[PDB]
């Protein structure tokens, strides 16, 4: 089964600086890559679908770029309403696997 991997299982950053999360997969996913953002005590809330598109209710800051087995979310100038875990799901093959989740933190 395709197993995602968010190698930087943590991050540390001040307010307003760019950050980039990588979700190298273990097989060709072909842009079937989604980014969910989980808050404390809530359910995940889809943020990016297709590894490039973007959903409604989110600003144009979050971006998604990748191809093959390497995809990256990019949060340029993260505000206060950006901390929380970030999971990368693949919906290519039959068991839809999630990423480990990179808990962001602040400084």
């Amino acid at each position: 089964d395709i197993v995602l991997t968010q190698s930087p299982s943590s991050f540390s950053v001040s307010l307003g600086d760019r950050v980039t999360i990588s979700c190298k997969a273990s097989g060709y996913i072909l842009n079937r890559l989604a980014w969910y953002q989980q808050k404390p005590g809530n359910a995940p809330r889809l943020l990016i679908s297709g590894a490039t598109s973007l959903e409604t209710g989110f600003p144009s800051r979050f971006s998604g770029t990748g191809s093959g087995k390497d995809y990256t979310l990019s949060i340029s100038s993260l505000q206060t309403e950006d901390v929380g875990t970030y999971y990368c799901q693949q919906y290519w093959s039959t068991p839809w696997t999630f990423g480990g989740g990179t808990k962001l933190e602040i400084r």
Binding site: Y28, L30, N31, R32, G50, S53
Partner: peptide, 18 residues
């Protein structure tokens, strides 16, 4: 080649290959 809309399409040779 950019963003595939409405998957299940099989709209390229790489998708068919994988």
């Amino acid at each position: 080649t950019g963003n595939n809309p409405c998957n299940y399409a099989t709209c390229t040779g790489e998708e068919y290959l994988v």
